[PDB]
Write a structure and sequence with these properties.
It is a single chain. The longest helix has 10 residues, at 27-36. A hairpin with a 5-residue loop joins strand 2 (41-44) and strand 3 (50-51). The chain has one domain (1-62): 434 Repressor (Amino-terminal Domain) (Orthogonal Bundle). By secondary structure, it is α+β, with helices and mostly antiparallel strands. Helix content is 40%, strand content 16%.
Length: 62
């Protein structure tokens, strides 16, 4: 897979809502990750899927 930085992914590839939709998580998660100021590695698959392994469903019951 191709590791993209969180903020850079949110500029070019998709939005914060689109990201939460692809992960199957809440936007409360994504906005916490962004406002934490931690650059997250977005696991970009060749089909177009993305996975944030930093962001487990155990974050908020996402």
């Amino acid at each position: 897979m191709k590791k993209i930085p969180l903020s850079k992914y949110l500029e070019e590839h998709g939005t914060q809502s689109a990201l939460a939709a692809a992960l199957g998580v809440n936007q409360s998660a994504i906005s916490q990750m962004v406002r934490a100021g931690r650059c997250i590695d977005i696991e970009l698959y060749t089909d177009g899927r993305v996975e944030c392994r930093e962001l487990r469903p155990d974050v908020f019951g996402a």
